[PDB]
Design a protein around this ligand. Sequence first.
Ligand SMILES: NC(=O)c1ccc[n+]([C@@H]2O[C@H](COP(=O)([O-])OP(=O)(O)OC[C@H]3O[C@@H](n4cnc5c(N)ncnc54)[C@H](O)[C@@H]3O)[C@@H](O)[C@H]2O)c1
Ligand SMILES: NC(=O)c1ccc[n+]([C@@H]2O[C@H](COP(=O)([O-])OP(=O)(O)OC[C@H]3O[C@@H](n4cnc5c(N)ncnc54)[C@H](O)[C@@H]3O)[C@@H](O)[C@H]2O)c1
Ligand SMILES: NC(=O)c1ccc[n+]([C@@H]2O[C@H](COP(=O)([O-])OP(=O)(O)OC[C@H]3O[C@@H](n4cnc5c(N)ncnc54)[C@H](O)[C@@H]3O)[C@@H](O)[C@H]2O)c1
Ligand SMILES: NC(=O)c1ccc[n+]([C@@H]2O[C@H](COP(=O)([O-])OP(=O)(O)OC[C@H]3O[C@@H](n4cnc5c(N)ncnc54)[C@H](O)[C@@H]3O)[C@@H](O)[C@H]2O)c1
Ligand SMILES: NC(=O)c1ccc[n+]([C@@H]2O[C@H](COP(=O)([O-])OP(=O)(O)OC[C@H]3O[C@@H](n4cnc5c(N)ncnc54)[C@H](O)[C@@H]3O)[C@@H](O)[C@H]2O)c1
Ligand SMILES: NC(=O)c1ccc[n+]([C@@H]2O[C@H](COP(=O)([O-])OP(=O)(O)OC[C@H]3O[C@@H](n4cnc5c(N)ncnc54)[C@H](O)[C@@H]3O)[C@@H](O)[C@H]2O)c1
Lengths: 273, 275, 275, 277, 282, 274
Amino acid sequence: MGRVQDKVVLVTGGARGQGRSHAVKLAEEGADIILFDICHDIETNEYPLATSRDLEEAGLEVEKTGRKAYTAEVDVRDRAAVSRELANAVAEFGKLDVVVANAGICPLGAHLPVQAFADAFDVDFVGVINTVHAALPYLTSGASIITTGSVAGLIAAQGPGGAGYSYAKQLVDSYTLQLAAQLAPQSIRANVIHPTNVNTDMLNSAPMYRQFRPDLEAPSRADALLAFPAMQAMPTPYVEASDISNAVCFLASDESRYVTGLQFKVDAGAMLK
Amino acid sequence: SMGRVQDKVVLVTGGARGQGRSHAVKLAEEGADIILFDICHDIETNEYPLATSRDLEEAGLEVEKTGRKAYTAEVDVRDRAAVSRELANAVAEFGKLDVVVANAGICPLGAHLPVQAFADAFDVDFVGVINTVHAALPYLTSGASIITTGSVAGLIAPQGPGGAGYSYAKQLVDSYTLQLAAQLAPQSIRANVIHPTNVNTDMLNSAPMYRQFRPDLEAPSRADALLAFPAMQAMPTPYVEASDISNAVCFLASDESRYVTGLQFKVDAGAMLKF
Amino acid sequence: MGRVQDKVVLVTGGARGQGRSHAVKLAEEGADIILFDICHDIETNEYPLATSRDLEEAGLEVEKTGRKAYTAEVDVRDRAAVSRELANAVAEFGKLDVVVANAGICPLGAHLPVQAFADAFDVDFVGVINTVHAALPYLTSGASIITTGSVAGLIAAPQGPGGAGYSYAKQLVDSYTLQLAAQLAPQSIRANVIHPTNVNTDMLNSAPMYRQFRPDLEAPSRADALLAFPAMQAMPTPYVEASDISNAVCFLASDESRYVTGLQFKVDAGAMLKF
Amino acid sequence: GPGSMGRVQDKVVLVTGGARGQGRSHAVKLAEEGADIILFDICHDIETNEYPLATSRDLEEAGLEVEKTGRKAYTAEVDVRDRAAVSRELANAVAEFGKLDVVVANAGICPLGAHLPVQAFADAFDVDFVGVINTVHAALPYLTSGASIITTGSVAGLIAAGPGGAGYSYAKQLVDSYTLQLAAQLAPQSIRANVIHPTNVNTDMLNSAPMYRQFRPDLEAPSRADALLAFPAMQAMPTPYVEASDISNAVCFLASDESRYVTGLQFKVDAGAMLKF
Amino acid sequence: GPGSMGRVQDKVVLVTGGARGQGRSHAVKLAEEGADIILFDICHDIETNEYPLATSRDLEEAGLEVEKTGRKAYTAEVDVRDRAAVSRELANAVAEFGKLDVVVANAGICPLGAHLPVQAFADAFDVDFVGVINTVHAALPYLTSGASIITTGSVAGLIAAAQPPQGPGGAGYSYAKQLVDSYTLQLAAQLAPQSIRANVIHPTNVNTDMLNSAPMYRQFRPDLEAPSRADALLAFPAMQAMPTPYVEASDISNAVCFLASDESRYVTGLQFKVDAGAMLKF
Amino acid sequence: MGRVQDKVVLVTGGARGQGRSHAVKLAEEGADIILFDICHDIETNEYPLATSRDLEEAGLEVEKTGRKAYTAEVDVRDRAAVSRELANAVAEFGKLDVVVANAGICPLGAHLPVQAFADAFDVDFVGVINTVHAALPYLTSGASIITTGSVAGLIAAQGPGGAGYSYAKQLVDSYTLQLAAQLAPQSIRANVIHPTNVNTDMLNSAPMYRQFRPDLEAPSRADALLAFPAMQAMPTPYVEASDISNAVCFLASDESRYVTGLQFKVDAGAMLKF
Ligand SMILES: NC(=O)c1ccc[n+]([C@@H]2O[C@H](COP(=O)([O-])OP(=O)(O)OC[C@H]3O[C@@H](n4cnc5c(N)ncnc54)[C@H](O)[C@@H]3O)[C@@H](O)[C@H]2O)c1
Ligand SMILES: NC(=O)c1ccc[n+]([C@@H]2O[C@H](COP(=O)([O-])OP(=O)(O)OC[C@H]3O[C@@H](n4cnc5c(N)ncnc54)[C@H](O)[C@@H]3O)[C@@H](O)[C@H]2O)c1
Ligand SMILES: NC(=O)c1ccc[n+]([C@@H]2O[C@H](COP(=O)([O-])OP(=O)(O)OC[C@H]3O[C@@H](n4cnc5c(N)ncnc54)[C@H](O)[C@@H]3O)[C@@H](O)[C@H]2O)c1
Ligand SMILES: NC(=O)c1ccc[n+]([C@@H]2O[C@H](COP(=O)([O-])OP(=O)(O)OC[C@H]3O[C@@H](n4cnc5c(N)ncnc54)[C@H](O)[C@@H]3O)[C@@H](O)[C@H]2O)c1
Ligand SMILES: NC(=O)c1ccc[n+]([C@@H]2O[C@H](COP(=O)([O-])OP(=O)(O)OC[C@H]3O[C@@H](n4cnc5c(N)ncnc54)[C@H](O)[C@@H]3O)[C@@H](O)[C@H]2O)c1
Ligand SMILES: NC(=O)c1ccc[n+]([C@@H]2O[C@H](COP(=O)([O-])OP(=O)(O)OC[C@H]3O[C@@H](n4cnc5c(N)ncnc54)[C@H](O)[C@@H]3O)[C@@H](O)[C@H]2O)c1
């Protein structure tokens, strides 16, 4: 008897990092997962995104719990693709209970053109809209929508991609609260998780290193690692994907049936600074 | 098969009934030994009954039924010295203290009540929280979790002096918890505040609360108030249940929430979205 | 000679109303125009959108000035389509200087489902994003991006989910436009948002809008609504005319505003002065 | 040319500080667009303002620059701090031109410098806010439905939300809030009021020893080439300033029936300045 | 009395609007505490302000009441709207007393009424904000280290800020009183280096001819077409948190005396509410 | 007849510093005074607090004016003790007119444990609550409650103790205005005085010197004096206790009968630096 027993969960960006961690955690707690991921790079985003193989490994990891996995290569900027693959996924499972709008990029770097802003926004905000809007027809009383924000985003309230990332995340937050209001009469909840630094390929990337160590020409991971902890008030350079998955599991579960419009910081006190 | 608070020691003030009892039992089910403090007598300005001695005994027995230990004591959180004394005794018995649930509270509503109602709501609902937290501090070590009970209706601000005192105390419980979270973060001790909307307990289900929800009748019954309760929430419900708050408490008390601190944890069925 | 001599201007929602008025004014001032419009209805929006005929007539009115018009039936919710048609128009006109993201719906009604919120948002915000993001590759030094907000939307910061979606979309058009102005400023490209009050077009003169303005009546006529329209303005008028917005569009599109960027350009007859 | 119909055709416009800089620029642009201009300027220095103000010849030449467009000009040396003089000279100008349509309350000083006494606060405030009040309150009895009042604020002023610099910013902050109060009061009569907030403008005010010293506090006493290196920091667009003509284009829009329903607008011409604040 | 040492002993105080009301009260209080007084008042009506202002006699009687304390009084009929006249008479007054220590910029009108034209906005603003400016600025070159500038605000004025009838004059009054407040703090910051103080006093309802006026009764009883004083007196107390319809001029003079006195030598930029708790309702 | 003629005033922290200055000023103006002070040190507060002798001498100073003094050793953290001694004092003096909740500590130091936060808070906020709540049953129309804030506190909105101090002082402010609202119908007033730096033992202390000169390891007074003036807009390193007592006297006197809910800065313009 798991904490999300027999629920069906959509996870965007589910191939690796937080998304894969959420898929596995929820499956461990008794849910079947629909995993969507781009599975190829975006040009202005100067670290590798997930591969086809990552998404496969992610399905396998889920299946290993005894739950079922639907996998699809889908770009969240493509609504029709999201709609299409979601109908397929529902066909297999018959239901959709939880939406985890987790996919995102962080195309940082001051030398990048304004396209990087557009790309950060298209994926990080518009892709979230596309995800929820595609998912709404399928949701009934008791459904839970979970969106991924960013503490660094809220603080901003790095170049064109950084700016677009921050502003997209501020809108993920305010949009989530609008959605919460709109869906509350139907007992469908919507909440935003705001992580601080998370130990994933997004954080452990060359553009992110240069962001934390602007004093250095070519900072290494070891150099950035010295600057990582300043973001948190607790003594840690980052939280783990598991820390985010714990909050996702709480919000996915009927345990949180009356939690909606919550700005759920998993930040090690970053916002207390 | 480990519990979510496996072998932790938790203090719960106001543990005799309502949310506090629900928190005790929930955390005991999840593998924690529980220290329950409750005043077990009424407060004059507060015009509905508080917990009785039989309540506290029954709370302790319900915890013991899970196979965990319960330490129960009649303690008024307005009494710093008595809080520290009993807690010393309980920590000595249980070995350690991992979690603090500063839940005890009163809601002394009524337009007719004197200023004492302000001072009483403030003394219990804020000063009592401070006294609970400060008495606990010397025992807490890295990974400890402090959980305070706020109130959405609080944050949103005929209620009288007791209602003004209630609202202001709850506002300060919120700013205080966040201030404490900043000071405790370098030691990896967390502090977070839960803000319930309406909760189905003796505090909500009380004559002064019914007068507050129905300012248009002079002696409204529960049936009259129950018609007005839903206005508070955005989701179609008159209140949430004690189990809903316990679920938030369990999450914050568990190592699942090791990097969650300074959070204003609304369990409010959308109440704050109407503001 | 003209105030936008030889410029090329994309106008979305160009078939009628403010959009067509912008096209014609800008053509009269020396610019060639690309006019996009959906030319069909949207189910949650309970008034008719422009027709194929409206769009052809708008193109003709542009050409009447002696300048060139490129028309295309295009849903701003479809970015592929916006990009495809803009490509065709640019290969014909050789250039793109000014973007007027004017297309919008106002799907009011207290009886409408949450779909109405998504449709308002998809068109009014995502449609603006799609428009601008499609235009971005083509812009050079001195380019001008003009978006259309709404005073009533700002103020929002019964109308039903559609009204909520509308208001929120317009708030985001505003904050998005300023963020984009910041990012484009290094290349001397500007972005400004125009916030009209009531404008005398089919959006304002529509059955859902009459009900919005007369919630005291079950079945208000235009005449009943026209009595309420002036309350929105501080000046004694029921609305501004499309020509008033077009005058502001022409300033922003002209080289005369080369250093005007990040401006929230109210043409509201004092509507915001009522806070 | 002869018989052109302009954007401000046949209007009568009052422009304070119309002797040089933005004021002269507005006077000319509005003349080119068909308006007859009443120009007011103090035409002497102010002791706390440590750069020279306009001269009598400057004003005359502003009148001449106007007539060169084909339009009529009325000039008077008037200190906006003297409401009686404002009233007396305006009443002369209206009886002779027969009407008043537009008010450009542009007169201003910027008496910067850390060493100056508090009088520099009083002088900045008396000219830049009281003189604006003096201008408007004097002109009001003449205005009817369709008139347009246009006050000059300042982005640097808004952002700030020595003693002369403190008085300048605060005065500009009040120009802004006062213009919006006035717009609300005059809306029922269909009279409009709006404020233009320039960033750096290439004028004698920006090109002054006090300003250079303010932009470059690092040099003990700097020059124009020095300042011109630190002017750009103020704008988001890659420029050290806007020109007087950029402001005159906004003025022309607000003076014109084109902007008949535009009121209470905080009209930034700032090259993106405010997007850094 | 004369032979002993008062709280403003041997100071010289300018009070504008000194002919009656709070101004006359301030003058007499300060003189009992050892100060000589310069009393300025307009001593004639303003047309948009639909209640009588002070009379020439009022001003004479105020000087005499100052003199009855044993101190010296200097009176002049001055419109605070005319800076040239403020500066001219202030020079004459200072030349006669030799010094200026305290400025109390108290002169004001409240030209309320729905029916009045926009001139009532301009008149409220010219008297209540521009008059205060002309008062302070005319005084500045006479002030040395230790001087104290005291401006009269208004709680009702401030409350109106937070708030989104009173007519053009009412709007000009509230906006003017909001500017008195922000202006006094700006001035306080600019004068602090010279050890010159500036503070603003914000009264709630005060029992004077301004409060006891036909336009004020319409303001307090908008439900009545022609409310009397008795009608208005039922609504007056709603402004205060303490149970009273108004404070007295003496209450305001007590705060003026504190601020004028060397007792408050390090008090500056203070927003000094004397409001019986009015601001606790907003 | 003095400005507080025949009133009975309770002053907490009355042994020395501002509290003793308030006592003697009010006594000179005709009031009998009740003086409470802890009269021993608090471990996390690394400068000496008042002694038994300070308190007794403070009472003698009051008596010298011809008025009566009642002194008691009382830790304002102990409400039971505050109530008991106050019942004793009121029994003797017959009534209670004015409460001046002045007792405080400032336990600064970056090295100190979180206990210093709790101690600063227990004394400087809960201590004030205890004082006011213990006095409420004695108060009638015209009574005046005067709490002591801190400009440095308001600006903050140093170590755990510093943070505890600033936060406590911020709540003294908001609490005092709540109390004013609640007591207004009884015509009982409550006002908060916010001082800037005051020339007392709290300011003239090694932890305060380290606070104003974080760039040094053992700052002397001379080192700290170079930095004290930056806090004020007027050219002074601090105000004196007498400046604060002057404000206390105004608020204690019937002269301020209608002043309530006031945040009374005596800050030499500190807050004008925002
Ligand atoms: N890592 C951090 O420090 C941090 C902090 C705050 C928030 N976040 C957010 O958490 C979320 C998860 O990121 P992560 O930390 O797991 O990094 P990650 O890069 O490992 O995971 C992001 C995943 O989303 C996928 N993705 C990217 N663009 C997509 C698109 N258009 N369509 C479909 N899938 C796409 C990627 O392939 C990748 O698998 C993101 O929204 C990110 O912005 C991360
Ligand atoms: N019930 C609601 O609608 C609601 C909403 C928001 C917040 N809250 C808060 O939740 C908390 C729990 O209240 P509840 O709903 O369980 O009601 P409850 O009255 O059933 O529980 C409160 C308990 O605290 C005890 N208590 C009260 N004063 C005490 C004191 N001085 N010392 C020790 N124990 C004391 C009572 O005896 C009782 O057992 C309170 O802080 C309350 O303010 C309640
Ligand atoms: N009329 C008002 O009172 C008012 C007030 C404030 C703001 N606005 C805004 O002004 C803008 C113009 O509207 P209007 O007043 O001219 O009304 P309108 O309905 O006459 O014009 C809207 C035009 O946009 C077109 N359109 C709608 N959805 C589209 C889509 N998805 N793709 C392409 N075209 C689409 C319509 O067919 C129509 O031609 C809108 O953005 C509106 O929100 C209007
Ligand atoms: N130049 C800038 O960078 C800048 C930036 C923002 C705002 N402004 C504002 O723009 C306005 C125009 O100034 P400018 O840039 O043209 O500089 P300027 O010094 O060339 O023009 C100011 C003109 O006003 C006149 N003047 C000054 N005091 C007067 C008085 N008391 N009475 C009558 N006339 C008086 C001067 O003689 C001068 O001709 C001013 O209000 C100024 O504060 C200027
Ligand atoms: N009465 C209240 O309820 C109240 C409340 C808040 C603030 N105030 C303020 O207190 C101040 C004094 O008013 P009061 O209550 O004593 O009323 P009041 O009308 O009795 O006194 C105002 C005095 O100022 C004089 N005066 C008016 N305009 C003048 C001018 N232009 N030049 C010189 N003198 C002028 C009047 O003749 C009169 O003597 C005013 O600033 C007022 O706005 C009054
Ligand atoms: N000195 C400053 O710079 C300054 C600035 C702002 C505010 N304040 C406030 O002024 C007030 C008085 O301080 P001061 O400057 O006279 O310093 P001080 O240390 O000389 O005096 C404080 C007095 O309170 C007493 N006291 C401390 N804890 C007590 C307790 N628990 N119970 C009873 N008495 C206790 C002390 O023994 C001492 O006599 C304090 O609230 C302080 O925080 C001081």
